[PDB]
Design a protein around this ligand. Structure first.
Ligand code: NAP
Length: 333
């Protein structure tokens, strides 16, 4: 018989790509959603091998118990749902607690009611490994060993810092659970940088603007006199992140590992240069800046050697990820 994979936050951008990939390899999927209609929409998109359960609040003890009890066929759990909204009334209630408590409660639910689950993957982030000023530093070398120094108290102050904290603390909690609770499953994490690339379904393009994907896609909203975007950092293609999740549960080597998913540096000029060459009909409708003035040669390469060895595949290049993302938006209008 077939294996079932559980995916929390099935509505999301990364989660959908993960689902499409997992389905392609012959797994069944069970997705968590915050509403019935949200589930129903996904079901129409993904078909018969996809099912959903409604889990409205992560941060309640036993939130996943019923859903797990309903799906004894599931032997893999991918916990991807997390807050990603930076502008909030209460950083704790809206960012920190759902990530941290929600993560702690999922793991406990799996141990309580899903002993059959062999593998759990937590979707972390580079923000778990760092602080904001570090990410942009040519002198900083991140690795799978890196942990953020941000305090919980500091993390509270505003939404961005809260997200950084939410990831670091939830991930630490996940590792702590494994140590303390001695579950049946092995844990692994995936720690991505900014995620670019096309959405899993064309139908989902119009609906919400994922904060990372929109960093690429927003270029289409520029006009000829606008400034070059100041957006900058490191990227990873969504399809690569999804493949990493697959590796994260499939490979023996992945057990107990953190995977740093990071490719190349970019800025707004890099982005503009790609789009203008690829979509030359847009050239007259976009700024030019200073083509190929971007220089990243000073930046020390991050140490992802272990992750790359474990994964064993090559990443999508920046132009490809960008072009694929734009082609989709154009197709849909
Ligand atoms: N994509 C990136 O650039 C990036 C970078 C670093 C790390 N990550 C990690 O990858 C995951 C996906 O990120 P994303 O960019 O795809 O964000 P996203 O598109 O907004 O996905 C977040 C999903 O999780 C659910 N969710 C959000 N906040 C929640 C809360 N407080 N309680 C319960 N459910 C909640 C939402 O479900 P509904 O649709 O039902 O609201 C949403 O579909 C994140 O958890 C993040 O930790 C992503």
């Amino acid at each position: 018989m077939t294996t079932s994979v559980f995916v929390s936050g099935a509505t999301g951008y990364l989660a959908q790509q993960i689902i499409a990939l997992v389905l392609s390899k012959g797994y069944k999927v069970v997705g968590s959603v915050r509403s019935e209609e949200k589930g129903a929409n996904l079901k129409k998109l993904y078909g018969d091998d996809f099912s959903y359960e409604v889990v409205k609040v992560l941060e309640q003890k036993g939130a996943f118990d019923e859903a797990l009890k309903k799906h004894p066929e599931v032997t893999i759990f991918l916990h991807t749902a997390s807050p990603v909204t930076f502008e909030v009334e209460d950083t704790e209630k809206e960012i920190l607690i759902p990530a941290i408590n929600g993560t702690k409660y999922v793991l406990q639910s799996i141990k309580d009611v899903a002993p059959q689950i062999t593998r759990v993957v937590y979707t972390s982030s580079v923000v778990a490994m760092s602080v904001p000023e570090e990410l942009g530093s040519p002198d900083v070398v991140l690795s799978e060993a890196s942990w953020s120094s941000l305090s919980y108290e500091q993390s509270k102050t505003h939404g961005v810092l809260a997200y950084f904290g939410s990831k670091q603390f939830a991930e630490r909690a996940a590792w702590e659970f494994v140590e303390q609770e001695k579950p049946n499953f092995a844990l692994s994490t995936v720690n991505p940088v900014y995620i670019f690339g096309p959405q899993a379904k064309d139908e989902e393009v119009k609906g919400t603007l994922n904060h990372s994907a929109e960093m690429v896609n927003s270029v289409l909203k520029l006009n000829k006199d606008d400034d070059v975007p100041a957006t900058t950092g490191t990227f990873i293609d969504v399809r690569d992140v999804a493949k990493a999740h697959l590796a994260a549960f499939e490979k023996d080597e992945a057990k107990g590992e953190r995977l740093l998913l990071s490719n190349t540096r970019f800025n707004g000029q890099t982005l503009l240069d790609v789009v203008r060459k690829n979509f030359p009909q847009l050239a007259d409708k976009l700024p030019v800046g200073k083509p190929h003035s971007d220089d990243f040669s000073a930046f020390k390469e991050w140490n992802d050697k272990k992750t790359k060895k474990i994964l064993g595949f090559e990443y999508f290049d920046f132009e490809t990820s960008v072009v694929d993302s734009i082609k989709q938006v154009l197709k849909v209008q």
